[PDB]
Design a protein around this ligand. Sequence first.
Ligand SMILES: NCC[C@H](N)C(=O)O
Ligand code: NA
Ligand code: NA
Ligand code: NA
Ligand code: NA
Ligand code: NA
Ligand code: NA
Ligand code: NA
Ligand code: NA
Ligand SMILES: [Zn+2]
Length: 867
Amino acid sequence: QPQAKYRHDYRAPDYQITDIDLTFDLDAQKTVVTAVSQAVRHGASDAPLRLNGEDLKLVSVHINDEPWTAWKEEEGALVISNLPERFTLKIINEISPAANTALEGLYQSGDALCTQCEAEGFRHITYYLDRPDVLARFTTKIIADKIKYPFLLSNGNRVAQGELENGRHWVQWQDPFPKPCYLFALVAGDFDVLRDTFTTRSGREVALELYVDRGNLDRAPWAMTSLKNSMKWDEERFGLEYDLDIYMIVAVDFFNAGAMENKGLNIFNSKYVLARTDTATDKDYLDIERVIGHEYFHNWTGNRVTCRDWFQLSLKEGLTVFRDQEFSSDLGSRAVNRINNVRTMRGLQFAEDASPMAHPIRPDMVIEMNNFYTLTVYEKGAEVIRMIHTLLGEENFQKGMQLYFERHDGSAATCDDFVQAMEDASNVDLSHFRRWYSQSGTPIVTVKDDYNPETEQYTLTISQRTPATPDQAEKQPLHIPFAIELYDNEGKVIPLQKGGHPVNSVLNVTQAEQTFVFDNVYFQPVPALLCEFSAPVKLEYKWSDQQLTFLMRHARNDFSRWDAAQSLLATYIKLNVARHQQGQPLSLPVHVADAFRAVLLDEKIDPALAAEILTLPSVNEMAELFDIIDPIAIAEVREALTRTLATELADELLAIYNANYQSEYRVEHEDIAKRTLRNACLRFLAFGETHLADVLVSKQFHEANNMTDALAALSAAVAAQLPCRDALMQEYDDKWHQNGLVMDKWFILQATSPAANVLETVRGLLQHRSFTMSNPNRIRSLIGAFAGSNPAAFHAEDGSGYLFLVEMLTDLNSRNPQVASRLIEPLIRLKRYDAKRQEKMRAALEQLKGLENLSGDLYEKITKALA
Ligand SMILES: NCC[C@H](N)C(=O)O
Ligand code: NA
Ligand code: NA
Ligand code: NA
Ligand code: NA
Ligand code: NA
Ligand code: NA
Ligand code: NA
Ligand code: NA
Ligand SMILES: [Zn+2]
C-alpha cells in the first residue's frame, strides 16, 4: 500500500511559510521542539493547511496564540482547517533521537546529536511543509546540557546565547537566506575544532570550522585544505564566492550518505573528512577532495538555486557532480578522472539503466524518494550536463550558468529552467536535447565506415536506438553529440572538412540513421570514435586489433588510448568467458600481450595513463559486455587474464615497479601517478612464481611508509591467495581494529576474497570486534561489498549468497531501511542471470516481500524486480 507520486501531479502550494523560529530543548530520550511559522495562503480560501509529520508527539497547536480546535491528525499529516489568509502557526511536539535508528531527522551519532533532512527528514522533527518549493528564513535556538553538548550548531550566524540554571545553556542561530527545510541542520556535541580562514577574491574573510570527535584533530588538515581549494576553484572557474561569514563542517561516524550540503553547516560522513598518511590512501585523499568540493559547490547549485520538487533532483545533483568532476580534473589528472568516471558509467550506471529500477535523470514516478539518489540521477545526470558543455563550449556554458543564477537565484527551479537558460544564453537549440531528461535506458550507437579512394571521402553511417525498459515502452532518437577524430597512418590528425569548409569534430547524431561525409581524406583513416565518451552510449563498431593498437600508440587524447585498450580487451574477455563455460582455458593472441608490453616500456606515456591501461576492467565493467551475466566465468577469466599477463610480462612488470619506487610519500598528483603505476604492476607481480611474489608483496606491506602502499600489498596477498595473506591480515587487524575507517578496507578485502570459504569468513565477521550492524559504513564494507562487489560468491550455485543477504535485509529492513535498500540492489538484477539463478533470486525476493513491516524503500524495489 505505500503510494506512488507522479511528476505530472506537481502543483503550487496552497500555503507558504516565509519565516520559521525553532526552539529545541534537546535531550537524547526526549527533545521538545517549538516551531513558530509565519504562513501565507496562496490557494483557495477554503483550503486547509496540510502539514507533513512522522513519528511526532503533538503537544499543542496555536494560530495567533489561540489554541486551535479545527484540526485533525491523519497518516503522516496534520490538517488544519478554517484559517485566516496570513497567520502565525505555533506547534509544540516531542521526538526521541535515541530511538532513531534510520538516521533521518534528529538522531544520535555516538554521543553527538545531528540531523539529516534530505529528502523528507524535517517532517520527523516537526509538522511542516516538507517540500523544497517552500522557502523560509530560519532562526534556531538550541538549549541543552552544557557538559554533554558544549557546541550547539545550526545554519548561519550566532545571534544570541545564554546560560541557564541546572547546567544548561543555549545558542541561537539565524540564516538570512530563505531555504527549503531539507537544508536545515542541527548538531550538538563535544568536538575538537580546526579553525582556519579563507579570503574571497573581493576580500570577504570567511571563518572556516571543522568539527571532529575528540582525538581526531590530526586527521583534519587535508579536509580543511580541500575546502579552501574548493572555494578558490569555484571563484576561478565559475566566478562564484561564498555568501556567508562562517562555513562549518561536522564529521560524524553514523551517516547514511557520504555528506550533506546544509547551508553553512555541512554534515559529513567521517569517511569523507578524516585522513593522515598512515590511515588513508591516495584514493581516500582524492575522494575527500571530491566530496568536500561537491558539498561546497552545492552552495550555489542546490542552495542559492534549489529544486522545485524532488523529481528535479538532477538539476542540483547532475550539475554539482559535473562541477566536482571539473574541480578534480582541473586540480588533478583530467585523463584519470575522465577514465574513472567512464568506468563508473559503463560498469555500474549502464547496469542500473538495464535494470527494473531504470528511470530517466528526471524521474516521472517515485514511491520512496530516497531510492532515487542514484547512479542515474548523479552520474548520468553529470554526463548530460557535460553534453551541454560539449555542445555549447566553455564560454557559452558559463554564460548559461550566469543567466541561470540571474534568473533563478532565491527560487526553487526545474531541470527545464536550467536547459532554457543554457539555450537562451548560447543560442544553441536544445529542444531535442531535452529528451535526455525524459527517456530512460542506454542508447546503442552503431557505426559503419567506408573509404572511397577515387573521391577521397570517408563516410560514417551512424545509427541509434535505445531498447525499451520496463518503465517505458516507447523510445525515440536522442540528440547525441558524437565526437570523432581521424588519423593518417603516421598518427597525424586529418582535418575534418566537406565542400571546402571545416566541419566540427562533434557530430550531431539526431536521427535513427544518418551518414556523415568527409572530403579531402587523402589516405584511408583510422577513426577515434566517441572521443572523451562524448555521450553516455554503447558503441558498436568492429574495430580490428591493429586499429586499436594503433590508437594505443598514437591517439592524441589520453582517454582514447585507454578506451582503445578497453575495446581490445573486450573481444578477448568475451572469447574467454565462452571458453570458460565449456571448460577451456584462456586464449590470448601474442599481439595483445605485446600491446600492453609496449605501454609498459613507453617512456613518453604519462604514468597516470599507463597505470589505467594496466588496470583491467572490473567484474562490473566485464558484466556490461554480456546479455546474460556469468559471474563465475567473469571472475575466473579476470584472474586468468591477470595471470597470463603476469607471466608474459614478468620482467617488464618488475622493472617498471622498481623504477617507480618513491622513498618520500607525498599527496601530489605526479607522485600519486607513479604510485598508481607501480601498484598496477604489483597486481600482476602478485601472480608470478609464488615464492618471488610472496616475498615481494610481503616486503611492500612491511616497508610501506603510507597506507596506499600497505593496502595495495595487502590487497594483492588476498587476490592471489599468497602464503603471507593470513599473517598480513591478522597484523592489520591487530594494528588497526580500534579504527573503523581503516578496518572498512579490511572488511572489503575479506568480503571480496577469492577464497573458497569467503561466505563462511564473512558470516564469522558479523561477530568481529570492529563490526556492528548499527553503523552503515561497517555494513557496507562487509555485507554490501560481499553482495555487490563479489558477484562470484554472491551468486554461488548453491544460492548461499542470496540466503545470507535475505538474513541481513530482514534485520536492516527494520533498523535502517535506506542502507537496506542499497544492499538489496544485487538481488534486483535477477533477469541478467541464468534461469536457475533467477529462480533462487525470485524466491529470496518473495521472502522479503512477505516481511512484516516491509519498508517502502524495499517495497518499491521488490515490486519492480518481481514484475
Ligand atoms: N546522498 C547525498 C546527499 C547530498 N544532497 C549530496 O549530494 O552529496
Ligand atoms: Na516562502
Ligand atoms: Na521557537
Ligand atoms: Na500525524
Ligand atoms: Na567560492
Ligand atoms: Na541543495
Ligand atoms: Na588537471
Ligand atoms: Na571501449
Ligand atoms: Na555491469
Ligand atoms: Zn550532491
